[PDB]
């Protein structure tokens, strides 16, 4: 996160931190007591499978208190549309071994519906994003769990705004942007797979998943977010879903 | 307005064109000056927009220029009042007043339902969780 | 379908309405409508009207800036096509209204014009208020008589040459505005 504040410990009690082979890999989003939303590129380069481990309730990287709780993932599953080195359908529903505890310090953030994710919370000006990612392009991670509060625009608006960039990735129906094109504020690479978090009349929902934008908080772009309602049913339809052996499952999308 | 004889009279802003309809030309007998004769005519030959009663709904109507404002009641809004602000909810009109998810019905009301963890209050539009830690609420600050 | 154009801003004493074009053919409109930091609120839904009533939004307060966008939608029925508008200032924006003189007395060697209150679309503790009411000392009233006179309240007093009968007009101006600085006259009435 680049230009946010620390966020309060307990505050975003939803963040979820995916470490691979136990060094820090990317942020999530717990949704209930066994699965967590992520970012799909944040798998490109995984060999270890089976050394993937969440963490809830963490705060400070480098201290353990008692409010922390790690889960094994038992299963990561991506859209079979996904293409590595790409970054549309940039989604992935992972499964804990078992189920996280509910506490003060660890809740999930609401899966909302499609309709209502996209009648009603797509025109919430602002949202949360959080992460310990890079405080700065190129910069070092961070230490204590930032957040930032960012206003979303639609597409059109967000194409006509922007630096035009000769060879970058088009702005699909599956993503939305949001941040400042000043220069000030974004989320950044190490934010990838943490919430955009909507309120709506006293409940938080999950909006977007920090994905992709031109460096961070480079002028004349704004960062940009999987749109989580296009996934509603396909996520809702894989939490149903037996178990498989192998931990990553690619499944159809729709 | 013009009877035998009455152009003998000097002319009479009350006479002829408030008691009565005048022409340009007799109210130019009243003012002389072509500029303040046209400022008077300039609204007195307007007409009164608010003679076709376009506020509805116990809307009050002020006459301008070639146009008019309507001013409604609390429950219309709309150009001539038009709108019944009692006939709008629909869920695309602020969630339909619903806490959480909001379903249209077409010809009968809108319903309002909850995510798992919740559940809809008395009034048809609150939701109350069910559970100890419900999703979306952040418990240190509650 | 296609996107709506020429939005403009048709508002006076904050009676506000938006108006685009073109009149559509298998298409239908809602409006949105929000100030730079406010989440947008929908108006309007699905009309086939080519204006939109924002009184009520804007009057909560007329000193913010507000935006409007019109979204198309294909008949029956990703993101919709849609066109913003300019931005709007209602305070720094609205038409002044037609005036009216409410009475002219021969306070003895003098003339005494009251202009009615202007009533506006402002409401508050369940009444409208006047121009007055919500401009306060950026509003004046000037009076044409025969040459001017110009007043802070809704009065004038003037001197006349007794017996002589005086013709009026009045105009409501924001002297600090450079665009849409007064209204029209009001209708003359004469002694
Ligand atoms: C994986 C996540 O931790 C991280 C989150 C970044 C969120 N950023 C902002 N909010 N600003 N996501 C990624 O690292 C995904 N990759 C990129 O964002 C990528 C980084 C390179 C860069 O130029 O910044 N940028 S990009 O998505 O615009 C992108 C993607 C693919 C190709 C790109 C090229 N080509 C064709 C070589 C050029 C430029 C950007 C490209
Ligand atoms: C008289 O009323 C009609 C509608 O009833 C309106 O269109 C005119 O503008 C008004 O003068
Ligand atoms: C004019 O104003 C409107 C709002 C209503 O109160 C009417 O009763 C009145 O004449
Ligand atoms: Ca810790
Ligand atoms: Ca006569
Ligand atoms: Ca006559
Ligand atoms: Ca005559
Ligand atoms: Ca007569
Ligand atoms: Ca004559
Ligand atoms: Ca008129
Ligand atoms: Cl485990
Ligand atoms: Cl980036
Ligand atoms: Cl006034
Ligand atoms: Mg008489
Ligand atoms: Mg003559
Ligand atoms: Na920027």
New binding site residues.
């Given amino acids: 996160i680049v230009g946010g504040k620390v966020c309060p410990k307990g505050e975003c009690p939803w963040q979820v931190l995916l470490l691979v082979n136990g060094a820090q890999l990317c942020g999530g989003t717990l949704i209930n007591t066994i699965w967590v939303v992520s970012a799909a590129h944040c798998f490109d380069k995984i060999k270890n499978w089976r050394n993937l481990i969440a963490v809830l309730g963490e705060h400070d990287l480098s201290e353990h208190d008692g409010d922390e709780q790690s889960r094994r993932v038992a299963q990561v599953i991506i859209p079979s549309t996904y293409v590595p080195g790409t970054t549309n359908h940039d989604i992935a529903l992972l499964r804990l071994h078992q189920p996280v505890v509910l506490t003060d310090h660890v809740v999930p953030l609401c899966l909302p519906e499609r309709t209502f994710s996209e009648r009603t919370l797509a025109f919430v000006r602002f949202s949360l994003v959080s992460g310990w990612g890079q405080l700065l392009d190129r910069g070092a991670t961070a230490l204590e769990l930032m957040v930032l509060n960012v206003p979303r625009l639609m597409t059109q608006d967000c194409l006509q705004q922007s630096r035009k960039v000769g060879d970058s990735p088009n702005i699909t129906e599956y993503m939305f942007c949001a941040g400042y094109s000043d220069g000030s504020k974004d989320s950044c690479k190490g934010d990838s797979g943490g919430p955009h978090a909507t309120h709506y009349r006293g409940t938080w929902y999950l909006t977007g998943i920090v994905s992709w934008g031109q460096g961070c908080a480079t002028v004349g772009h704004f960062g940009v977010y999987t749109r989580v309602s296009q996934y509603i049913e396909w996520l809702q339809k894989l939490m149903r879903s037996e178990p498989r052996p192998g931990v990553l499952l690619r499944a159809p999308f729709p | ?2 009877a035998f004889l ?2 003998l009279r000097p002319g009479s802003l009350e006479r ?1 064109c408030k008691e009565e309809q005048c022409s340009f030309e ?1 109210a130019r007998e009243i003012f002389k000056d072509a500029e303040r004769t046209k400022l008077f005519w300039i609204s007195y030959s307007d007409g009164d927009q608010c003679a076709s009663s376009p506020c509805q709904n116990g809307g009050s109507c002020k006459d301008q220029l070639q146009s008019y404002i309507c001013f409604c009641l609390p429950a219309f809004e709309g150009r001539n009042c038009e709108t019944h602000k009692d006939d709008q909810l629909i869920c695309v009109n602020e969630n339909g007043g619903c806490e959480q998810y909001c379903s249209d019905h077409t010809g009968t009301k809108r319903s309002c339902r909850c995510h798992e963890g919740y559940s809809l209050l008395a009034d048809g539009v609150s939701c109350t969780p069910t559970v100890e830690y419900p999703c979306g609420k952040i418990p240190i600050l509650e | 379908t296609v996107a709506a154009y020429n939005l403009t801003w048709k508002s006076t004493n904050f009676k506000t309405i938006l108006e685009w074009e073109p009149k559509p053919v298998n298409q239908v409109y809602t409006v949105q409508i929000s100030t730079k930091s406010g989440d947008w609120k929908s108006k309007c839904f699905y009309t086939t009207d080519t204006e939109c009533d924002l009184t009520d939004e804007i009057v909560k307060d007329v000193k913010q800036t507000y935006l409007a966008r019109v979204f198309s939608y294909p008949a029956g029925n990703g993101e919709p096509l849609y066109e913003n508008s300019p931005e709007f200032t209602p305070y720094l924006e609205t038409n002044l209204g037609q005036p009216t003189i409410q009475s002219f007395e021969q306070v003895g060697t003098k003339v005494n014009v009251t202009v009615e209150d202007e009533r506006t679309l402002v409401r508050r503790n369940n009444t409208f208020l006047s121009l007055r009411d919500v401009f306060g000392k950026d509003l004046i009233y000037t009076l044409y008589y025969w040459k001017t006179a110009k007043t802070n309240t809704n009065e004038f007093l003037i001197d006349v040459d007794k017996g002589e009968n005086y013709c009026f007009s009045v105009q409501a101006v924001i002297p600090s505005r450079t665009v849409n600085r007064k209204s029209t006259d009001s209708p003359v009435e004469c002694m």
Avoid: K, P, Q, Y
Wanted: net charge negative.
């Fill in positions: 307005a013009n009455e152009e002829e007799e």
